[PDB]
Amino acid sequence: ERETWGKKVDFLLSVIGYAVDLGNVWRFPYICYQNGGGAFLLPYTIMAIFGGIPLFYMELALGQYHRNGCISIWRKICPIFKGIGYAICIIAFYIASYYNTIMAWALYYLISSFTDQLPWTSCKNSWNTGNCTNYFSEDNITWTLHSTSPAEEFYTRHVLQIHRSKGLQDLGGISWQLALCIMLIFTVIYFSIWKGVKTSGKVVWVTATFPYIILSVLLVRGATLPGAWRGVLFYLKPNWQKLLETGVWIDAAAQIFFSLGPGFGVLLAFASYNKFNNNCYQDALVTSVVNCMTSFVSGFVIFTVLGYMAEMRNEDVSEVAKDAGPSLLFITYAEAIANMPASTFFAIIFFLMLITLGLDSTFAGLEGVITAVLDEFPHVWAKRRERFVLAVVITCFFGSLVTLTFGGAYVVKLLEEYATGPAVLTVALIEAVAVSWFYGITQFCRDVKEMLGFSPGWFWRICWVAISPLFLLFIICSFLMSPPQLRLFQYNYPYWSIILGYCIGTSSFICIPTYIAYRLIITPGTFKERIIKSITPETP
Ligand SMILES: CC(C)CCC[C@@H](C)[C@H]1CC[C@H]2[C@@H]3CC=C4C[C@@H](OC(=O)CCC(=O)O)CC[C@]4(C)[C@H]3CC[C@]12C
Ligand SMILES: CC(C)CCC[C@@H](C)[C@H]1CC[C@H]2[C@@H]3CC=C4C[C@@H](OC(=O)CCC(=O)O)CC[C@]4(C)[C@H]3CC[C@]12C
Ligand SMILES: CC(C)CCC[C@@H](C)[C@H]1CC[C@H]2[C@@H]3CC=C4C[C@@H](OC(=O)CCC(=O)O)CC[C@]4(C)[C@H]3CC[C@]12C
Ligand SMILES: CCCCCCCCCCCCO[C@@H]1O[C@H](CO)[C@@H](O[C@H]2O[C@H](CO)[C@@H](O)[C@H](O)[C@H]2O)[C@H](O)[C@H]1O
Ligand SMILES: CN[C@]1(c2ccccc2Cl)CCCCC1=O
Ligand SMILES: *[C@@H]1O[C@H](CO)[C@@H](O)[C@H](O)[C@H]1NC(C)=O
Ligand SMILES: CCCCCCCCCCCC
Ligand SMILES: CCCCCCCCCCCC
Ligand SMILES: CCCCCCCCCCCC
Ligand SMILES: CCCCCCCCCCCC
Ligand SMILES: CCCCCCCCCCCC
Ligand SMILES: CCCCCCCCCCCC
Ligand SMILES: CCCCCCCCCC
Ligand SMILES: CCCCCCCCCC
Ligand SMILES: CCCCCCCCC
Ligand SMILES: CCCCCCCCC
Ligand SMILES: CCCCCCCCC
Ligand SMILES: CCCCCCCCC
Ligand SMILES: CCCCCCCCC
Ligand SMILES: CCCCCCCC
Ligand SMILES: CCCCCCCC
Ligand SMILES: CCCCCCCC
Ligand SMILES: CCCCCCCC
Ligand SMILES: CCCCCCCC
Ligand SMILES: [Cl-]
Ligand code: NA
Ligand code: NA
């Protein structure tokens, strides 16, 4: 028999810690500022109500009924789409390649914070070149275009050492400091998810609830600051005319789908361990509302601190938050923390928040892949979950050996934009179409009624058959036609970077058509018999 969760709060906190991550602490406030303001919460809630939330509930109920991973459920839903599972696996190898190393940066920052004076306050250090001017109106104020804040120098010349990498063309060298700081992270991850869901479910009691104990302290500190009101009044001020631009809705859809994550193959893995009669409706509602409210509150703390630091300089906002990426956590917020009264305590606390914020998501992705593979091939890797988790962790670390180089930030951005792009959305769209159209939403509603005790309402069937595919289609058709012009640390990505990104995404996607061709060509029969007997779920 499978290994059930052992306690319901284990499942709740696992999903809650997987939904909240290092992205929505820097990505949601930046996105809310850039795309409107308080007028972005309307498209956020509109694309959450009809978008991420019904897909979230669909995946949870599907996994909890079929009791399989993401490579084996398709044996009893639509056998031709089994390739989806493989695609999901590949996607993890990309995300776990870069996501982990971001936490590595955080860990290094935390190791740097154990000093009486934080290293990114003064700029008389070794890595700190000219063009500093000490920032924050320190002594003589001659802030020019060539000047650079000390935290920027610390991030891009000590933690990253990106100045010894000419660019994405030459990723010269490799940081041994970051290599150690990520070997420790992978040790933590593997020893937290190795024994399965009986240990990875009690670990997330302290890495999915510590970020809240830390957000509370960070919020109470930020709110009682000089310049908090300007930091919030520039976060919730509605640019209503911004709603008229399709980009705002496109971005709200992308944000909700990539913060809830309905389609990465992890919700099925977590829900498959649930008891049969477990209420997935209440779990989906609670762990989606908690995700959305956590994103909102994290935006509050980020913007209150930003407003404080912009009021200290007595200069306007939107030039403080120039950088659109993890730099915001390591260059801007680190600066504002370094100017706080008890700078050391809040630096340590903030980077502990970041590490515990990313750890749950890494646990969840890795365990989704582990469950999928452990269930697809049950005879091999049965009494050896530990060895397979070891192989998964080693493979992820070896794939993360490139983002640890000096041009590490370049590959981190390249994997951040691609990999998790139209490939993930296409996989999720094929999942929604396979369950709702092929397996039939009437049979899915019969399954959900025999589990929960009530058939899904008309809203759920309408949002599963029609609106949710017509939402992933919106995101996909809007990501493909508009190609990004990537940039990071005054580096214009080359021509071949977009080709490399397209190949990165296609490597993930091509798992689906390949398996479709394989199954249609190996199956005996005529021209139509192949598809008719490859759509019907396999008899037990
Ligand atoms: C971000 C800051 C400013 C707000 C702090 C929010 C937390 C205090 C909340 C958010 C999510 C909550 C958790 C969400 C899920 C659950 C599962 C719940 O478990 C049950 O299902 C038990 C129900 C019962 O039988 O009474 C126990 C509370 C707990 C851990 C909650 C405890 C309180 C938490 C951490
Ligand atoms: C603006 C201020 C007052 C903050 C208060 C917001 C909450 C009261 C709302 C905002 C979004 C809501 C959620 C958005 C989506 C839904 C789906 C909804 O599903 C349905 O069955 C809806 C049926 C229908 O819409 O006809 C159940 C409630 C829930 C979780 C909502 C619960 C209540 C939430 C958190
Ligand atoms: C010391 C540094 C420089 C190298 C790190 C090596 C790791 C890849 C190894 C070393 C110790 C290993 C663990 C020690 C022993 C085993 C038992 C091994 O056998 C089982 O399947 C145990 C089954 C059971 O628990 O009964 C499974 C892998 C595991 C847990 C290992 C997981 C991988 C670890 C961390
Ligand atoms: C169905 C066949 C497709 C299989 C895979 C084909 C590979 C195609 C890869 C194309 C890569 C585009 O990758 C995608 O580009 C969009 C375009 O805005 C960028 O997306 C970016 O802008 C959007 C707004 O639109 C926001 O959500 C956010 O600021 C960021 O994600 C990212 O870079 C990536 O999400
Ligand atoms: C892309 N980010 C996610 C993720 C999934 C699996 C592994 C790592 C990560 Cl980072 C995708 C699902 C929503 C939030 C989550 O962090
Ligand atoms: C600042 O940087 C520019 C090039 O980015 C360089 O030419 C200039 O000499 C630097 N200033 C100082 C004081 O080092
Ligand atoms: C009528 C329901 C609209 C829901 C809007 C939620 C976010 C609005 C925040 C308050 C406006 C500044
Ligand atoms: C992140 C990669 C997921 C799939 C795991 C590949 C390696 C499995 C073991 C192969 C060597 C024995
Ligand atoms: C119940 C919460 C579990 C938190 C993570 C494991 C803690 C183990 C402590 C004993 C070994 C040092
Ligand atoms: C996100 C906070 C809760 C949203 C609704 C959860 C539904 C639980 C059923 C009982 C509500 C009182
Ligand atoms: C029984 C499984 C057969 C699968 C054949 C092809 C799988 C996808 C290959 C795409 C590149 C990894
Ligand atoms: C694609 C699965 C069935 C393969 C049968 C032969 C198809 C050959 C013509 C299409 C080539 C693109
Ligand atoms: C709570 C799920 C059902 C919501 C109502 C759907 C139909 C609305 C009236 C046409
Ligand atoms: C040599 C075989 C490589 C894998 C073939 C997968 C099916 C091809 C369909 C035309
Ligand atoms: C995660 C399991 C990968 C299996 C891929 C099979 C492809 C055969 C060519
Ligand atoms: C970093 C956590 C590792 C936990 C392993 C426990 C080993 C005890 C002998
Ligand atoms: C049975 C040993 C499990 C050890 C869990 C360690 C968790 C580290 C974060
Ligand atoms: C019943 C679940 C209790 C969770 C408490 C975790 C607190 C960790 C600091
Ligand atoms: C004990 C099993 C370890 C297998 C490591 C595989 C690494 C693949 C790159
Ligand atoms: C310069 C030291 C490199 C450390 C990593 C190489 C072996 C994993
Ligand atoms: C139940 C709807 C399935 C999709 C319809 C496609 C018509 C060509
Ligand atoms: C889009 C194809 C749907 C087929 C459903 C199964 C046949 C009734
Ligand atoms: C097939 C069950 C009801 C579907 C409602 C309409 C979807 C477009
Ligand atoms: C999307 C709502 C459809 C309602 C039609 C069926 C009412 C019994
Ligand atoms: Cl969010
Ligand atoms: Na999130
Ligand atoms: Na987390």
What does this structure look like?
The PDB classes it as transport protein. The entry lists the keywords sert, ketamine, antidepressant, transport protein. The chain has 540 residues and is mainly alpha-helical. It has a single domain, classed as Up-down Bundle (Amino acid/polyamine transporter I). 64% of the residues lie in helices and 0% in strands. It is built from 23 helices and no strands. Helix 3 crosses helix 19. It is globular. The protein starts with 7 loop residues before the first helix and ends in a 5-residue tail after the last helix. One dodecane is lined by residues 282, 285-286, 289-290. One nonane binds at residues 187-188, 191.
Structure in a nutshell:
Helix content is 64%, strand content 0%.
What is the terminal separation in angstroms?
Answer: 17 Å
CATH class: Mainly Alpha
Give the CA-based shape: globular
Bound molecules: cholesterol hemisuccinate, dodecyl-beta-D-maltoside, (2~{S})-2-(2-chlorophenyl)-2-(methylamino)cyclohexan-1-one, 2-acetamido-2-deoxy-beta-D-glucopyranose, dodecane, decane, nonane, N-octane, ...
Note the main sheet.
none
CATH architecture: Up-down Bundle
Strand content: under 5%
**Element string (H = helix, E = strand):** HHHHHHHHHHHHHHHHHHHHHHH
Which quaternary structure do these chains form?
monomer
Question: How many discrete structural domains?
Answer: 1
Structural class: mainly alpha
Determine Rg (CA atoms, Å). 24 Å
- The total count of helices amounts to 23
Give the beta-strand count.
0
CATH topology: Amino acid/polyamine transporter I
| Percent range of helical residues | 55-70%
